[PDB]
Symmetry: C5
Subunit: 198 residues, 5 copies
């Protein structure tokens, strides 16, 4: 039953150890589902956004045989390793709006999708036109380079009561290298093309 699965998880899950298999990197899939655009300032180039951050990855230290057992459980994220994702152009702390629970499938596949309110620095010019503005958000591991964590991409849920509407969303994979460091860090660049409603 579920208590057993959680107990075993508590026994074997190592929340501070990245679950790399055969010394290849962990493949993290990240996809943003925009829910609201709350505040926009064309002068400062700052936006206040609400989004579901769909995150999936594999951790075999959580897996169990589900032949006559449940095949999925909800588990506190503190009992699990979670990717240390950060939005590189963020200017507020992510405000998590939802219960911090992840879904674990018996094969060790993990899905964690918090609802997040966060403020970003990005290009707001054109928000009042019909081409719209395009705000770019880059999300990637803060401390794990491309050999430890890879980041891959995978408007339906957007609020009808926003002052804004979404024209398009593109999610592309990027990789940034730095002076200080020899390795490249992956991110997904999320282009939010949106404009103020007419």
């Amino acid at each position: 039953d579920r208590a057993d699965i959680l107990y075993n998880i508590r026994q074997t899950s190592r929340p501070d150890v990245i679950p790399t298999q055969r010394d290849r990197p962990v493949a993290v899939s990240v996809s943003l589902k925009f829910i609201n655009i709350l505040e926009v300032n064309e002068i400062t180039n700052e936006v206040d956004v609400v989004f579901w951050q769909q995150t999936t990855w594999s951790d075999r230290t959580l897996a169990w045989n589900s032949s006559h057992s449940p095949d999925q459980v909800s588990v506190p994220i503190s009992s699990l390793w979670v990717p240390d994702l950060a939005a590189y152009n963020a200017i507020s702390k992510p405000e998590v709006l939802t219960p911090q629970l992840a879904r674990v499938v018996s094969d060790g596949e993990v899905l964690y999708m918090p609802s997040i309110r966060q403020r970003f620095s990005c290009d707001v010019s054109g928000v009042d036109t019909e081409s719209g503005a395009t705000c770019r958000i880059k999300i990637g591991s803060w401390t794990h380079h491309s050999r430890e964590i890879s980041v891959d991409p995978t408007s339906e849920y957007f609020s009808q009561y926003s002052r804004f509407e979404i024209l398009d969303v593109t999610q592309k994979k990027n990789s940034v290298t730095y002076s200080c460091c020899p390795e490249a860090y992956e991110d997904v660049e999320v282009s939010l093309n949106f404009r103020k409603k007419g």
Copy 2:
């Protein structure tokens, strides 16, 4: 006595384990008792509301024979499993204003009713009219589908006489939604708050 009951509750309650019995779902009742409407913005469609979030459910692992005992106790919710409920259109963290204590009956019936201040995105249009505005708030489990958690409904009586607004009607209807991504159904209660400026 009460130390005994709390002590056994500490022995038996598994706060991270959903108390499903025989693989039926936990049946959760949710009812919002509105106390105040504090800030209203028709331009941005945002409201600041205070409500008592009446939440009831059963956890039989908490039960005790109450023949020569109290049949009810107050218990910190951190000692209990609580449903992972979220308001889908919330745009602030719920700010809990009250002591986070639930009431537990000897048969394992749990009552948790925090007073909550929260900000929502919803249709504020018509608030200064005689029809009023109708703000809809949907509350449901964030990670548990209908085979694990069911949500059912069970309001001017508690509403502040000092609000600038008055309540015209409250309707609570249950929904059950299936998704693109996912094979299972998720239940919610939709609370339609019809209110206007005095």
Copy 3:
């Protein structure tokens, strides 16, 4: 000594267990001592207030013989049961400004008086007049009914001129704190509260 008294207190105190004796309720005395009034909004009927919440009750499981010991000690409230008081018309979380320490007397009497800043919904009308405004705040247990917790004022009436800031834009004309026992539709039980009427006006 003090280290011993706190040791015994930790041996026997249970913060999640109301210290009811002989199936009777715990008698809680509550008194709000207002120190400042920060914001008042007559349009929205809201106030921002700072007050000392004098809270006393008895817990006989903490008692000790003080013939050759101190007769009073300070204890983290995380080591004690404290009443789950809430103001029914609060519109913000209580913000505690002071060290969260309770005073425990050798006979088991507990005094906890946090300094608190909080916002309330209440009648602000007349505050710019000379009759003043009268804002009523009700404080009672959130989850314990009258057979488990009773709530009383310590003293009912004062002008509070011993505690209220002289540098406020407001002055206090009167504070009367009276006991109530108010009921709800849903429930067969009565809940006790103290209703605190703050009569104050803008200077």
Copy 4:
């Protein structure tokens, strides 16, 4: 070594028990070093202030022989008893800006100096003149009376005061006081800090 000292302190320190020696009081020294005056409101009589709260006292239960060991260490305040000091006229929670670490000397002398931003209710009248306003802040133990805690002052303190503030400090006086209340038979000691300051 330093780990040994931290261990010994954890063994002898009772962070929840006041370190009175044979029922005489703990002598706490308190001194405010003003760093900035951030917001000032003459209509509401409120000021937003940043200050270093120098707090020193003795806990002989922490002492050790430092003949060939360090004579001082830094320790999380959670490992120590600290005085339950509070400002009687504060209207906000003190916002601690610095790491919450105390310095402990091998003779058991403790220094804790948080940098604090806090908002107060006090006399702001005259702030736009050349005599300036004089704001009084009272800091004392919240729950310990004078036989348990005594409070004494330890300057212009403009030595640390910010030059980029809109305000300047004309004088700071720190006087010791001890005030009694109606209900109760005992007095509580405090340091009253007088900030004479004006708009530049």
Copy 5:
């Protein structure tokens, strides 16, 4: 492997004890990488900044033989000693925007770089001109003097700055300071960071 390295760190790390090698000081390198200027107030002399706080130091108790193992790991900072650095003219709590993880190399070298949003008191005069304003930020250990913590610059500091800010960076200079105070017999080291920036 990595579980073994973390287990080993957890076994050997002493998070509340400063890891001096003999009686030499712990050498912390500090470098601020400015990312944004969010708010600027020329009347009050206050700025709101976002920056990456590059912090490096060595702790050999964390060292391991990485012969056929990984040479680096990510570790929660709660498992490590980290220097009690504080900004001397800050007027808000540092708000950490990023996961609070440090990078540890097999030789005991630690890299911790949080993204931080913080408000400072500093000279904002000239921001609407072409000389620009020069805001100066001082960062150093709050409680460890120079015989326990040394603080030095690394060496850019403005390459990763947002192109979408209302402001631009004209120059960043980082110099080392060393101050002794009236009260205390020791000197405390800091890094001074000069941010020359203007409104576009």
